Symmetry: D2
Subunit: 387 residues, 4 copies
């Protein structure tokens, strides 16, 4: 039946189901949602948690009484539904003061204002019980070559993340940070565009154990890269703290389709990788219900994300647990890929005559790899057509 | 006149001017070149050095007498022309034994054979006086999801690079290693596809001071990324050991056009970045003369690469040394970008009331950035139309 | 000095300089512009005309008195400045009633409403003296495969364009129609995505002499196609009625940069093609001033478009009028490309023994084409470095 | 069981299963196949026919005795297996005499040689009983802007196709012509890059009833376009004469994967479109077995193409024949899309007050479209998870 359970750890953003449909060529098609109503509806669908921007919960320019009133209503809804908040983030892209950037704006006072806004939201997020803080560098980039000195911008971004790490260490919080890469949209070229650039940036920080990545399926597919390879490098580094799941149709604008739409085979291999590696964080959906839909379509899209994940998880487990698949995996020598190359050592490899002087390159080249048979078994298990 | 001089450090690969024109849909249009003739012609054009694959210099399957004869003729040509060899590399992609991979092939004996071939070529490269060794992971990837376990492949690639570093340390050589990223072509998805992935991989190695990157303009433009941003992150990390210059028209197959063709504005900003940062390595051209050309067209393309670089270097220096440009750079607050954000410290930033409580967001948002005026000055200096 | 003159026929849209900066992730950074002020400023910069959407001039839901008042003020500004209106268009994408489409919406009453709105705007455009009407099919497409039956949608689009042609024929107007293609943004896939699809659609209409295309540089570059090839096929068909000039950096979202930015070499070849073919329509700029700029940056961008066109026109004329270039064009046999293949006829070609039986394929294959020398001369003329 | 039958009309090219694995960076991994052996193996798998290039069957430079001997052996194998030949084509891209082009080469004598070669192969194809002749314009394009005058090239291509039509009309053959579009690879930009450009070219020919298109899934996906939309426009024009099925992973080089791999959802919607429209031509597979495979992998890939088509055909028929799907299609108003917009006429539409003056735009905008529910039903039917 593929019914979601709270052990699946499915979470949704408030900006996802609360999107009003304002695109660059059109007005809003839906009215605004109350966050309390969003929590109650998502708890009815069987979700585990919600995430938020600071401006999603408290409107910009609110007084302290309005701030504490919104926080009190939102914690009341969380206590009534039993829902959790596992991640929060700050909005440094909507207001026109951030048009040049946030942490790497050319104006020093804008950079200081962005740091103070982030610190205030980190205090609220620890108050609500979040475990991961996400920084999205949305306005950090340039449309032209001379507008932004990139080495200086990387120095300012390093300084900002070092200050945030110093603050959480001095306060004694247990929250960690995560960086969300994206290649373009809305700037012409965004700093730290991929998972690899984000990981290489994290290794230069002062306390590199507090920082990880938060990759998104759509953002890695906008650069034509392969999302399971990117996720596997992040897992190899030990830095996958949180993940965003959606869909995307090739290299174009950010579509943010529901999960399973877009590249279905890549979604299958991604669910295979996460269930095999034992990733235990939240399964966060960052999608936009299309502006042709009313509220019933919104809730149908939100249910469809979780249903597609549960179907792909069942099919991937059935593919790995099949004896003919295990025979094909031995025939393609994946078990030999898992073996060490030279554990006997460098001197033994240099003295091994079977490794250069007496190695039959023609006999080694004549062997096929049977990858097409393996892939056809994977396609049959995905489509349900084993027979 | 833009005449190349040996102080410019222009180098060419033997595979560049020696390409016979065999593309996937056509036969060769040019006969094979003698490497001695290539050295003499490139010294006549005013180049500084040549680079080589092992199979470019010594054909596959050659005996030891043929090996030493080819090496003796090639060093004789280098001594007669005064040309140098600043970089070498090994060929782990042409022979059909490497169809699944080289360092990360599924076959253990193929991995051991690839390591022994690389070690032999490293000995030859130190004998010829090279300073940088380049590893291109061309066959390391997959066309399908189940063919390659990517975490295990990253373990084998780490093991191979650690063994090579152990060998050069035990021999006492001064040569360093460099990794060339590429997103696809000829596999469907290649491991370590960008500069960011390569840098993040290098930080996990055992002796990370021996390894850097060798980025190529065309390969970063095949993923839709921005090459000056990638080069600037590599310079910020201190890992730019060598660079490949060519041209590319957007996201498609590897064209390897001559330098200056493709994206001319990006070429301008790249030359600006290298001359500003003071990169002192070789300027290596990795281009393919198109198969419609005869040998006169080959030599005209090779001269055109160096001419386009010298023109762009003159225009970029004239753009930076202009007082109206310096006034526009102050008006866009690049000098304020170079200033530290909070050097007074975290506690002073938290107590600063002008940074959150009394900060005029509307007055800060009303200021323009004058980026379009700056970019129009850059375009006028590139086109030569200051007036 | 490259100063624009009214003989250059430079026109701008009101939505171009009137864009407030609202992108999908941010609010507006600039206040709204009066159309009268836009006409006066563009006449001061040296433009020839303006174009408009119906909703740019008259706000949605306006009464008839407000309609005639806006029209009277706008014609007064046109009479005071001497500016013209050579093109108009209708807005069928902003209001949420058009969320599924306009001419090809699934709702019949929405299709009838869209036709009536277009007919009313055509009457206004003939009243202002326009010569070309532009239909942009912005919302005509789908995000999913089952949402839109494409053959039925093409039937409805044919029916709508046939009705508009019947109306202008019955009224005796002299205005013509033009279709603007675009591959995606804001739908996932837009019907009639390229110039070729638009031309093939036009040939199936009832009165195909009234319909042409209106191609845009950015929209053809979002699909990775080559804009001079597309423009040359439209000129070969005799259907280029109007053209939109802007810039675009590869395959991503619609950037709408100023002209000359993006792909400078492609801009050079486009200006070469239009000046060689003698295109006599307006040179229309459809660009967006970036949201980091204030009004001085807006007017600087608008001046920069015209300046870049005048510089490229001078350099292309100097390239064609050069005797060494003419010698290189004879060496690459472009004059032989202009000659007919078999004007002697099919029977003479079949009896010609020099064409198959006695044709030296090796001697024909040995000849080079000298394309690289020709391209280096073109690059030298573009950069101003002939010497 | 999804077993192929001769009523399915599955055909394969000889170049598909006969590909030796020579890619631009590697040598061949498989030996050459006898065409007789290819016919016998494909008849054992359950195919219906084969297609060929002229150089696939008769090697270049063969004498007349060798020509008639190869033809006699090949017709003997066709008579023994009962296989047919429904399509043929000529090779104007491999030999280095065609490096600049074929029908639109800059050399007049090369153009005449290409026409004579094509006419000889057309005689052979009618002798073998083919019904469609395919022209692929592989070398017709340019790497640079000045190398090719595109209007003159379009004149020469029109002249060549008019001569071929005149020849088949004078001989009284019943064969038709088809044009295969492709955006790039191996030239930088190929003339007639998409289906739309090919259709617009066909409408300018002298006898436009003899010419159609032959689209390929991979070639339309290399430009980021949507293949069911392109196929539906070709069916709307009545020009779909033949089709090529393979797979492709986004915008990169021509992968030519087996069918079903790549974009599985797009493959599902394509099979839905062909079975709904009743296309009765051959289902031709143009794929390359990957160079990691031996001959068993070749035959497994060839069987996998037909199996994936039969599975998708069953799932699409089950999706269309479902009552809940039919209810959802009525709720998304596809039946209202099939209705004519104004069959009452232009005057009745202009006098209809319910169409502009009394039309409730807010009530029309408030209705949802239920596209997400429809798409989730389609995904459930594709994955086999109706429950
Ligand atoms: Mg996104
Ligand atoms: Mg996200
Ligand atoms: Mg390359
Ligand atoms: Mg290279
Ligand atoms: Mg646009
Ligand atoms: Mg436009
Ligand atoms: Mg292909
Ligand atoms: Mg094909």
């Amino acid at each position: 039946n593929y019914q979601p359970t709270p052990e699946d750890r499915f979470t949704f953003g408030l900006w996802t189901v609360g999107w009003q449909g304002r695109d660059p060529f059109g007005d809003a098609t839906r009215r605004a949602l109350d966050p309390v109503e969003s929590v109650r509806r998502l708890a009815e669908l069987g979700a585990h948690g919600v995430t938020f921007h600071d401006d999603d919960l408290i409107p910009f320019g609110s007084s302290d009484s309005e701030r504490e009133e919104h926080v009190k209503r939102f914690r009341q809804a969380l206590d009534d539904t039993g829902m959790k908040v596992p991640m929060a983030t700050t909005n440094l892209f909507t207001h026109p003061v951030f048009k040049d950037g946030g942490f790497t704006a050319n104006d020093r006072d804008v950079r200081r204002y962005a740091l103070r806004k982030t610190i205030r939201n980190i205090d609220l997020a620890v108050e609500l019980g979040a475990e991961t803080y996400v920084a999205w560098g949305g306005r950090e980039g340039a449309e032209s070559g001379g507008a932004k000195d990139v080495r200086d911008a990387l120095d300012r971004m390093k300084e900002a993340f070092d200050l945030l790490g110093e603050y959480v260490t001095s306060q004694g919080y247990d929250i960690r940070f995560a960086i969300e890469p994206k290649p373009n949209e809305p700037r012409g070229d965004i700093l730290l565009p991929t998972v690899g650039h984000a990981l290489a940036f994290i290794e230069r920080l002062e306390r590199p154990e507090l920082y990880g990545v938060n990759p998104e399926v759509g953002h890695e597919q906008m650069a034509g890269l392969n999302f399971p390879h990117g996720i596997a490098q992040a897992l190899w580094a030990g830095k996958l703290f949180h993940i965003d799941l959606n869909g995307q149709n090739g290299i174009k604008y950010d579509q943010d389709l529901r999960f399973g739409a877009g590249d279905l085979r890549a979604a299958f291999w991604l669910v295979d990788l996460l269930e095999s590696a034992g990733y235990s964080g939240p399964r966060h959906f960052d999608f936009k219900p299309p502006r042709t839909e009313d509220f019933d379509g919104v809730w149908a899209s939100a249910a469809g994300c979780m249903r597609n994940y549960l179907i792909l998880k069942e099919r991937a487990a059935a593919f790995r647990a099949d004896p003919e698949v295990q025979e094909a995996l031995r025939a393609s020598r994946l078990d030999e890929l898992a073996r060490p190359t030279a554990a006997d050592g460098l001197q033994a490899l240099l003295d091994d005559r079977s490794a250069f002087e007496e190695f039959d390159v023609d006999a080694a080249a004549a062997r096929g790899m049977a990858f097409e048979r393996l892939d056809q078994l994977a396609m049959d298990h995905l489509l349900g057509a084993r027979g």
